[PDB]
Amino acid sequence: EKRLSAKKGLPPGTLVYTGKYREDFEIEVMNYSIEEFREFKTTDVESVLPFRDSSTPTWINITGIHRTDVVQRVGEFFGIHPLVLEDILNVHQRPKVEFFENYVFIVLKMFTYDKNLHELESEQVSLILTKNCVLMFQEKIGDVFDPVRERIRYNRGIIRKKRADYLLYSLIDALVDDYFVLLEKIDDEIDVLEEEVLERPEKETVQRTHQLKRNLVELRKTIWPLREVLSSLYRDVPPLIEKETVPYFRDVYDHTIQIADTVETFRDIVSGLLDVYLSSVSNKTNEVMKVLTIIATIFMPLTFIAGIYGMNFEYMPELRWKWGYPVVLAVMGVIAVIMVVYFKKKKWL
Amino acid sequence: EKRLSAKKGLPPGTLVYTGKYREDFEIEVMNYSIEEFREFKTTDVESVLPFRDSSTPTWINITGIHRTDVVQRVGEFFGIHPLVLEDILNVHQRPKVEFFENYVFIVLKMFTYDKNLHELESEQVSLILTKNCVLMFQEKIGDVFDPVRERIRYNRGIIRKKRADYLLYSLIDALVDDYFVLLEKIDDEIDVLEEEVLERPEKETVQRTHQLKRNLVELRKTIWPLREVLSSLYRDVPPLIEKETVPYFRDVYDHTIQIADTVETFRDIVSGLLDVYLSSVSNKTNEVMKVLTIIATIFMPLTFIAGIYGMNFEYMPELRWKWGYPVVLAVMGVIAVIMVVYFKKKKWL
Amino acid sequence: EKRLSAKKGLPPGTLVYTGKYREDFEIEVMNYSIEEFREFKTTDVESVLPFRDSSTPTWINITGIHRTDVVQRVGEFFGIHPLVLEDILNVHQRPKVEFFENYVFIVLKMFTYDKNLHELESEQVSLILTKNCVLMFQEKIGDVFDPVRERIRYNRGIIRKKRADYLLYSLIDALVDDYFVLLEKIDDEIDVLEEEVLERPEKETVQRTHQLKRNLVELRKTIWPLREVLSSLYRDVPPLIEKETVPYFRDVYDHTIQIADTVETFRDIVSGLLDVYLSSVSNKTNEVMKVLTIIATIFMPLTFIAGIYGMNFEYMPELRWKWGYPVVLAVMGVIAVIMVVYFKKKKWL
Amino acid sequence: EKRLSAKKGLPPGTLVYTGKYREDFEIEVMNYSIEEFREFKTTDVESVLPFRDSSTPTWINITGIHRTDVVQRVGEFFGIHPLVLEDILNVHQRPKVEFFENYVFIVLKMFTYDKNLHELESEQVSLILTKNCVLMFQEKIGDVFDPVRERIRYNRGIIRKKRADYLLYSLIDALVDDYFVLLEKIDDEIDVLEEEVLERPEKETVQRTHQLKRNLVELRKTIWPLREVLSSLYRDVPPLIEKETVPYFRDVYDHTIQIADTVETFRDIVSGLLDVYLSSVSNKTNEVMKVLTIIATIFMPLTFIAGIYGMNFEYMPELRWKWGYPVVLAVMGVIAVIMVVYFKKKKWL
Amino acid sequence: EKRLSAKKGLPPGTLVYTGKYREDFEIEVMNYSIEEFREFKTTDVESVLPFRDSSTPTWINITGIHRTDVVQRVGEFFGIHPLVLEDILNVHQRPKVEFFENYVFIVLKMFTYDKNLHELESEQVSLILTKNCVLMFQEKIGDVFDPVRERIRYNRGIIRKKRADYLLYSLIDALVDDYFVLLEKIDDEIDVLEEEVLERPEKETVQRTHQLKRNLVELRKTIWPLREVLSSLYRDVPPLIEKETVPYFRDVYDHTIQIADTVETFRDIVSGLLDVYLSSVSNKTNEVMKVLTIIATIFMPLTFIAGIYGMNFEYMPELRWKWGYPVVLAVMGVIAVIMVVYFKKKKWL
Ligand SMILES: [Mg+2]
Ligand SMILES: [Mg+2]
Ligand SMILES: [Mg+2]
Ligand SMILES: [Mg+2]
Ligand SMILES: [Mg+2]
Ligand SMILES: [Mg+2]
Ligand SMILES: [Mg+2]
Ligand SMILES: [Mg+2]
Ligand SMILES: [Mg+2]
Ligand SMILES: [Mg+2]
Ligand SMILES: [Mg+2]
Ligand SMILES: [Mg+2]
Ligand SMILES: [Mg+2]
């Protein structure tokens, strides 16, 4: 509900945060070299500026992108094009890669699937690589870049050795890796839903299926173009070093394909999943139909026979018929049996 | 209904307005430069002519395109090809871009979705960029170019600084932006329809679904080729300046993709939406089936038992059977219970 | 039925008319220049021959192509390849364009949809452009080229000025224009069928849908490759003048795309149209189910109660129970009400 | 059933016939020139060898390809690659074209649809064109190359004039032509099945549909890649003469497209054909539902009324009510009528 | 269940076995030349090292890839890139081909379908070709490379003559051949399932269909990209000899296409297979509906007639009507007959 993407009647240079989360704000900077390590959390937009010309690869984090003054001030000092800055403040946008002679701009989307409930939230994560610096813009607190920090903080891996271009890889690779966790959560919900559809189905089950299907399509709407997002990098990378950045992006490019294939795999399953429900229900009804019919067929005629001898008349042959009462109960028994014999037959005649 | 696109048995140079709205007519001209601003509304076709050679970027609006004399007179003075003029008067046509050495011709479509009713009207908007002049042809009064006027009128943005080629961007960008508003209106109708399908469904609901689906397909029929319309510009723009016009068209080209993706996203949802209805109805019927059966199964046999003792005979063992009347009422109670015990079982047997 | 396309066990040079209409035969020739106009109807195959070297653009019509002797004699004198002549006499063939150094061969298909009945007939129209001459081969009398004749006969348009290559455009454009008329006829049938499916559905409705769907697919089978047919011309035209023929073919090429899009638009509608019928029927059945159940549930138990006091016994407490007859009628009233109160509930439980 | 394609755990040079027909064996050779004609049937593999260097175009037929000794001996003397020979003995393989400097290898599939039964048999036909010689390998006796023989035997057509490369055309064209006969047989079965689905449907009808659909898909599995098979030839033909072989292959290449389009046309029809059956059945059930309900609604209440006066009591107001017996029969008549008046209403309420 | 692919928060150089089988470990080496043959089974990682520079083509087998120490030690000595080694230990990955100047890395997947149960296990098989050496990494004991060993062990075929590059072919060809065996197993299950759906359907049948469909999609998820896997080799092979390796890969490349076509063929069948079940069930219900209705229609009115004469009144015309009891039994007979005459009619009215 709500969250309407409009920004209508506005010039392209307009800077407006269209997101849900304008609650909190934070800036974090992690500068590093093979020798040293440093990091701090400030709300000052001025302190992060002189790091632009820093030779050492610097990782800049900006949370609470709702602050337009910060975005503009940062973009102006880095010479970032207004439209690029505008795309950042627009939380409703398809992930992409826009190459520039000065920098590289990339839009990405984080995801979080709720437990004991069916909902998929999405926080847009934009990043910019220029010189030795890498920006990162988010909405709320929390990310998947925590182990990236640790590997830098604890000097764990080659991430300390190589530059910010390889850091860019690590940041992307960390996010792409998170999608696998998301898929497994969704894959569980499918298996749970599959069971509910196959056996013991009930009300609201159809609703859950529609929820899953709709959420699954929206998921592909993000992941599917994300393939081209990484496909663009793998075959271009003009400022990035070919000797290092290229073969690593390849593995990430391999991941997003497997992820996209995994998503499309689910859509095919969920699509035919609803028909499975419909097939089961009709089968249940068909079973119930058999039950109702074999009853009404072995009583209604026998009920009618009782109604015959139930109706009073001036002339009744039963008084002249010895042992009529038992044989009437007996002849109905034969009728009851032969119908059952007539039943257990070959249906679909 | 009606609005049949025929114009059969006519030479290609024929100028005929095939639209619904021939009611009113208006011409508006907005000339501007970084120094000054001017605009007026006249019905004279002669007054707008000398603006052709105006160095300042001039925005020409022509409403009520039903007037063929105006279209021809304008096209002749601008040296516009007859077929191009013919395409304008044809309101039933797929949006496109036809490049020429003198000018650039673009067909576009406005939309308006009705509230408390399901209908999608479409007004074709054609425009031509030549020299420093930009034409715009419409059917009826009203447009999405009002903020474009204001930004020029109030000197708000870079639109005053740059030329008509950037104005072309602003005009297109203003229209493309309107589609987002249209989608949100439709997205609401889906959510409303989804609820009606999922819970408390009734008559005419299916009709609304068919209305939405049909209107949604027609929507894609316009938006889908509009992608190529802007894709053509982004990779060509021969007369337009590359230093400015190109990177701005890119953002618009990014918008139409997201819009087209948003539309196709809906089609997948609406497609399986009808099966959700069918799945629910069969489930309801299956529920009703269970109700009817468990009733007829616990009465018809007991009804038959009553018919037995209801039928009169010469020999009745009930008179020789002490307390037969209560035990008959009692033995039927056991039958009633064990069936319910037989019920609440595992269905789909 | 019938109309089997076989011609099996035959050499490629075989000339056999495989069409339904061998009834009548006619040859018409319309030669013209910017100065003069001439036309006549003869059955002589010799009189049309010397027009081959005529400098003036000549339009040759040959109706009743069943005459193999005429086709061969014409093809031989024009140096037309046997296979091309063979393709002409084959009425069952997909429309195409085969370029040659001497001429250009094009297969096209006319259509006529019947009113008050569902059927689509198709007459193959082949044409050949060589030098200043343009051939046209048909099956039966009647065509859409009547206004083409009039525009030439009355000197109406530029068709008199330009050559046979532009006449080729006019001939094609006249035929492509006819498809719009066909679509509108079909579009009406859809709207009529949609109404019948949405409201007041009955028997044979499904048959009409299957008829429409099947006829619609066959329609696309012709129109869809016809796109490439005109796409081939627009990007090649080796003998045709680029200064004139090319930009006009473009408009026709734009038409066939809109037509093909219009057809595919219908297929998507007709596809889900059948499910709408199925959805409505099940809803009707579900409604009928509710009616039947709420009846059997408020009578069968009350019927059983009557059967209790209907059954005769030696001991009846009713004689010792004052006002039993009214209170039995009263207690059943409560049962009848509470079930209705139990009804009007939330279904799909 | 059976016919399992395995040949597992075998080197690529293994020569094993995997077909069903190893019953009979035959070799036929038809050598010809514009002057003379000769043919004979021998079982000798040695007699066919010296024809390799024959200047005259020679047509070699080998039936009963189960004989591995013949295949190897022929392949060795012609210098044919082992894998090519292996592909021949493999009857389960997708049709293709493998170009070589010495020869051209083509896999093709014959078909035969049974009457009064639903089954599609397929015999793989492989052929090799080298020098002036053309090989042809089959499984069983019988083919579509009989008129090809006759046209050569009777010197009927240009097939006698041109070389084996044109003979290759004739052989292929003869086979491609056979598919049209196959389609017409299948097209009849569809029309017959359509009628059975539309009107008077019964048991086993669904089975026939599943048989047709499955057989239709397998048909496309052969014809669809056969398009590329001929598409490969039309755009390559390195050893074949361009002045003759190319334009003739074009017509065949046009045929296979029309055939493939005809097949895909059927799949779309057969797909929605099953839903037509389902739509009809539900409509029948809905009709039966109406019948059952309008009965139970006009009797069960009236039956209950009879049960009221059927139940015996100490106090009966009927004895004090004059003409009660007729008016009870009368008041039930009103109830019976008003329900029918209540019926014939607007359903789907 | 389980087998979650995560490895989150880890540097790219991390070596972790993500497979199910860490149970057993084995290394086997088969070195060979046209003169000699040798093989042995050791657990020593050092003994396999000096074979790297061996001129003779050497086949190295490593089972139980869970041992990370072996993988790293082998990769380091061969100069294998860490990411390549990482991909090996990742059992959840899409098959691919990554070319390098030193070697060629290929991921492949073995399969085993269970009998009397529906499940598809998959063991990833990775291999590396460098110099004259070919590595092969597996999870558990058992493979399809047994006949490959035998053909080498018994000097059976050309596999002994040619080098490891041709051995690479044999290894791949042996695996690709196994898929045919897998398909035949699945094809049987389809035919068995088809029968169960067409005739004598029951509970759990739908579940089996959903199992087959889901397993079939996952099967394509592996085989479909495997086409491009071999398509990459066939058109590149930089270190492999063109004179031998290329034409053999072609046959394998032809196999994987036929396999992929065979899989997609099944998906189309299985898709419409569920609707066949739904169509049959509704037909059964429709049959049961007819049975129930024709009963309730020929008794309920006759039951009501009995209730009339069953109801007691002060005035009964039956005593004044001679032979009323028989004629009541007679008039009901007429009603019973005419309804049956009314039945056996044209349904779907
Ligand atoms: Mg904007
Ligand atoms: Mg990897
Ligand atoms: Mg026109
Ligand atoms: Mg933007
Ligand atoms: Mg022919
Ligand atoms: Mg036009
Ligand atoms: Mg082999
Ligand atoms: Mg032909
Ligand atoms: Mg990693
Ligand atoms: Mg092979
Ligand atoms: Mg369906
Ligand atoms: Mg009674
Ligand atoms: Mg009684």
- Chain A residues closer than 8 Å to D203 by CB: 348-349
B-chain residues near E310 (CB < 8 A): 310
* CA pair distance A159, A152, nearest whole angstrom: 7
User: Which backbone phi and psi does D11 adopt, to 5 degrees?
Assistant: -65, 155
* Count of residues making up chain B: 349
HEC readout, A31-56: EECCCCEEEEEECCCCCCHHHHHCCC
- In the DSSP assignment, the letter for residue E134 is E
CA distances from D115 to B135, D188, D191 (A): 68, 11, 14
Task: Report the C-alpha gap between D266 and D187 in whole angstroms.
Answer: 8
Measured between its terminal Cα atoms, the distance across chain D in Å is 52
- Decide: helix, strand or coil at residue B76: helix
| Residue indicated by tokens 């330009």 | C162
Which residues of D fall within a CB distance of 8 Å from C312? 312
* Under 8 Å between Cβ of A205 and A277: yes
Query: Do residues B263 and B220 make contact, with C-beta atoms less than 8 angstroms apart?
Result: yes
Please write down the HEC assignment for all residues of D46-60.
Answer: CCCHHHHHCCCCEEE
Between helix C82-89 and helix D245-296 the angle, nearest 10°, is 20
What count of Cα atoms within 13 Å lies in the side-chain half-sphere of residue E63? 14
Pairing mode, strands A120-130 and A103-113: antiparallel
**Distance of residue A35 Cα from the nearest chain B Cα, in angstroms:** 41
A86 CA from centroid of ligand 1 (Å): 8
- Residue C275, judged by CB atoms within 10 A of its CB (0-12, 13-18, 19+), counts as buried
The CA C83 to ligand 8 mean position distance, Å, reads: 6
Cα distance from E43 to chain D (closest Cα, Å)? 28
Tokens of B80: 């516009």
CB E137 within 8 A of CB E129: no
Nearest CB partner across the interface for B282, out of A87, A278, A306: A278
Distance, CA of C185 to CA of C212 (rounded, Å) = 12
**E325: helix, coil or strand?**
helix
Question: Residues of B with CB below 8 A from E203's CB?
Answer: 348-349
> What residues does B10 pair with on adjacent strands?
none
Instruction: With CB atoms and an 8 Å threshold, state whether D349 touches B203.
Output: yes
Would you give the end-to-end CA distance of chain B in angstroms?
52
C-alpha to C-alpha distance for B79 and B102, rounded to whole angstroms: 8
Residues 6+ apart with CB under 8 A from A250: A234, E98
Chains with ≥3 CB–CB distances under 8 Å to B: A, C, D, E
Contacts by B99-103 with C-beta closer than 8 Å and gap 24+? B99/B232, B99/B236, B99/B238, B102/B130, B103/B78, B103/B128, B103/B129, B103/B130
* Nearest CB to C306; choose among D159, D269, D308: D308
- Amino acid (one-letter) located at B163: R
The helix/strand/coil state of B140 is coil
- Chain C partners (3+ C-beta pairs within 8 A): A, B, D, E
Q: CA-to-CA distance for D268 and A348, rounded, in angstroms?
A: 28
Residue B125 DSSP class:
E
- How big is chain C, counted in residues? 349
Q: How far away is chain C from the Cα of E348, in angstroms, using its nearest Cα?
A: 7
Report the alpha-carbon distance of residue E169 to residue E184 in Å, rounded: 23
CA–CA separation, D184 and C2 (whole Å): 10
Q: Which residues of E touch A251 (CB under 8 A)?
A: 12, 83, 87
> Alpha carbon C191 to chain centroid distance?
15
Environment class of residue C33 by beta-carbon count within 10 Å: exposed (0-12), middle (13-18) or buried (19+)? middle
Question: For residues E112 and E182, what is the distance between their CA atoms, to the nearest angstrom?
Answer: 7
Q: Are B215 and B120 in contact (CB under 8 A)?
A: yes
State the Cα–Cα distance between residues E64 and E83, nearest whole angstrom. Answer: 19
Contact (CB, 8 A) for E245 and E215: no
Residue of C nearest to E304 (CA): C303
Contact D272 C275 (CB under 8 A): no
Q: Is residue D76 within a helix (H) or strand (E), and if so which, with residue range?
A: helix D68-77
Count of CB atoms situated within 10 Å of the CB of E126: 25
Residue D315 to residues C302, D94, D223, E313, Cα–Cα distance (Å): 20, 91, 87, 12
Q: What is the radius of gyration, based on Cα positions, of chain D?
A: 35
Query: Which residues does B53 contact at the CB level (< 8 Å), separation at least 6?
Result: B131
- Kindly write down the DSSP assignment for every residue of A202-254, as one continuous string: -TTHHHHHHHHHHHHHHHHHHHHHHHHHHHHHHT--SSS-TTTHHHHHHHHHH
Mention every residue, 6+ apart, whose C-beta is less than 8 A from residue D41.
Answer: D26, D27, D28
Catalogue all structural domains in chain C, each as residue range(s) with its CATH number.
Answer: 1-153 (3.30.460.20), 154-271 (1.20.58.340), 272-349 (1.20.58.340)
CB B21 within 8 A of CB B8: no
Alpha carbon distance C190, D103 (integer Å): 56
Q: How far apart are CA E161 and CA E151, in angstroms?
A: 11
A149 contacts A33 by C-beta, under 8 angstroms? no
Element (H, E) at C181: helix C164-198
User: What tokens were used for E261?
Assistant: 């076509």
- Using a CB-CB distance cutoff of 8 angstroms, which residues of chain B are in contact with residue C310? 306, 310
Contact C217 D269 (CB under 8 A): yes
Residue of C nearest to A201 (CA): C349
| Residue B227 and residue B261 in contact, taking contact as beta carbons nearer than 8 Å | no
Closest C-alpha to A303, from D251, B131, D179, D307: D307
Residues in contact with E226: Cβ distance below 8 Å, sequence separation at least 6, in sequence order? E95, E108, E109, E256, E260
Q: Taking a C-beta distance cutoff of 8 angstroms, is the pair D223, D260 a contact?
A: yes
Look at phi and psi of residue E301 and say left if phi exceeds 0, alpha if psi is from -120 to 50, else beta.
alpha
Contact C309, D313 (CB under 8 A): yes
Main-chain phi, psi angles of E64, to 5 degrees: 75, 60
C-alpha E45/C-alpha E76 separation (Å) is 12
Q: DSSP letter at E96?
A: -
Alpha-carbon Rg for chain E in angstroms: 35
* CB-neighbour burial class of residue A276 (10 A; exposed 0-12, middle 13-18, buried 19+): buried
Q: Which residues pair with A32 in a beta bridge?
A: A37
CA distance E248 to C319: 103
Per this entry, what is the length of chain A?
349
Best residue in A145, A152, A282, A343 for a mutation probing chain E (most E CBs within 10 Å): A282
| C-alpha–C-alpha distance, residues B173 and B256, integer Å | 10
Q: Helix or strand or coil: residue A60?
A: strand
Closest chain C residue by Cα to residue E348: C203
| Ligand positioned closest to the Cα atom of E258 | 10
For residue C1, the one-letter residue type is E
By three-state DSSP, how is residue C327 classified? helix
Which residues 6+ apart lie within 8 Å of C239 measured at CB? Answer: C104, C129, C165
Among chain A residues, the shortest Cα distance to D206 is held by: A348
Determine if residue A344 is left, alpha or beta; phi over 0 gives left, psi from -120 to 50 gives alpha, anything else beta.
left
Residue for token pair 């239709």: D216
Q: CA-to-CA distance for B328 and C310, rounded, in angstroms?
A: 13
Instruction: State how far the alpha carbon of E2 is from the alpha carbons of A187, A267, D31, D215, in Å.
Output: 11, 21, 69, 40
Give the 3-state secondary structure of residue C100.
coil
For residue A83, how far is its CA from the centre of ligand 4 (angstroms)?
6
Residues of D in contact with A346 (CB under 8 A): none
Chain-centroid distance, C-alpha E287: 37
CB contact under 8 A, E203 and B310: no
Residue type, C326: P
Distance from CA of C4 to the nearest CA of D (A): 7
D112 forms beta bridges with: D121
Identify all chain D residues contacting C10, using CB atoms and an 8 Å cutoff.
147
Are D282 and C282 contacting, i.e. CB atoms less than 8 angstroms apart? Answer: yes
**Closest ligand by atom to D252 CA:** 8
Resolution (Å) of this entry: 3.8
Residue C67, amino acid: R
Distance CA D267, CA D220 (A): 9
Which residue reads 């009578």 in tokens? Answer: C299
- The token duo for B124 is 């074709």
Interior/surface letters E51-81, b for 16+ CB within 10 angstroms, e for the rest:
bbeeebbbbbbbbbbbbeebbbebbeebebe
Contact E247 D96 (CB under 8 A): no
CB–CB contact B251 A11 (8 Å): no
Instruction: For an interface test with C, give the residue of D293, D297, D321, D345 to mutate (most C CBs within 10 A).
Output: D293
Structure-token pair, residue C59: 């339009």
Q: Which of D98, D197, D325 to mutate to test the interface with E (most CBs of E within 10 A)?
A: D325
Six-digit token pair at D320? 């004090």
Amino acid at B178: D
Among the partner-chain residues A275, A286, A292, the one whose CB lies closest to the CB of E292 is A292
Contacts of B227 in chain A (CB under 8 A): none
Amino acid identity, position B341:
V
Block residue for tokens 């489930």 = B283
Is residue D249 within 8 Å of D230, Cβ to Cβ?
Answer: yes
CA D126–ligand 1 middle distance (angstroms): 63
Separation between Cα atoms, residue E106 and residue A346, nearest integer Å: 55
**Six-digit token string for E318:** 């039956």
How far is Cα C104 from Cα D35, in angstroms, rounded to an integer? Answer: 37
Q: Are C106 and C96 in contact (CB under 8 A)?
A: yes
Min Cα separation A66/chain D (Å):
52
Give CA–CA dist A118/C30, Å, rounded. 73
CA B319–ligand 7 middle distance (angstroms): 91
Q: How close is the Cα of D256 to the center of ligand 5, in Å?
A: 12
Residue A290 near residue A348, CB atoms below 8 Å: no
Tokens of B144: 């999405």
Q: What is the phi/psi pair of residue D320, to 5°? A: -95, -5
* Beta-ladder partners of A37: A32
DSSP at E187: H
Q: Which of A190, A230, A247, A236 is nearest to A213 (CA)?
A: A190
Contacts of B344 (CB under 8 A, 6+ apart): none
Distance from CA of D203 to the nearest CA of A (A): 6
Mutating which of B275, B286, B297, B348 best tests the E interface, going by the most E Cβ atoms within 10 A? B348
CB A150 within 8 A of CB A180: no
Interatomic CA distance for residues B11 and C158, integer angstroms: 8
How far apart are the two ends of chain C, measured CA to CA in Å? Answer: 52
CA of residue C339 relative to chain centroid, distance? 54
The reply to whether residue E348 touches residue D284, judged by beta carbons under 8 angstroms, is yes
Name residue D102's amino acid: N
- B206 neighbors B285 (Cβ within 8 angstroms): no
User: For residues D31 and D133, what is the distance between their CA atoms, to the nearest angstrom?
Assistant: 9
Give the Å distance between the CA of B188 and the centre of ligand 1.
Answer: 23
Task: Name which of E83, E240, E221 is nearest E166 in CA terms.
Answer: E240
Sequence-distant (≥ 6) Cβ neighbours of residue B85 within 8 angstroms: B15, B71, B72, B75
Q: Dihedral of the CA atoms D310, D312, D313, D316 (nearest 10)?
A: 50
Phi and psi dihedrals of E217, rounded to 5? Answer: -65, -45
CB within 8 Å: B303 and A302: no
Question: Token digits for B82?
Answer: 């007859």
Ligand 6 centre and the CA of B278: distance in Å? Answer: 44
Q: What is the three-class DSSP state of E341?
A: helix
All residues of chain D having their beta carbon less than 8 Å from the beta carbon of residue E244 are none
Partners of C310 on chain E (C-beta within 8 Å) are 310
Torsion of CA E269, E271, E276, E281, to 10 degrees: 150
User: Which residue type occupies C15?
Assistant: L
Q: How many CB atoms lie within 10 A of CB D154?
A: 11
DSSP 8-state class, residue A29: E
Smallest Cα–Cα separation from D239: which of D101, D336, D38? D101
**Using a CB-CB distance cutoff of 8 angstroms, which residues of chain A are in contact with residue B307?**
303, 306-307, 310
Cβ–Cβ under 8 Å, residues D68 and D89? yes
Helix, coil or strand: residue B177: helix
Q: Which among E108, E107, E48, E98 has a CA at the least distance from the CA of E78?
A: E48
Helices (DSSP H) in D131-244: which residue ranges? Answer: 146-153, 164-198, 205-234
Q: Is the dihedral of CA E199, E205, E210, E213 positive or negative?
A: negative
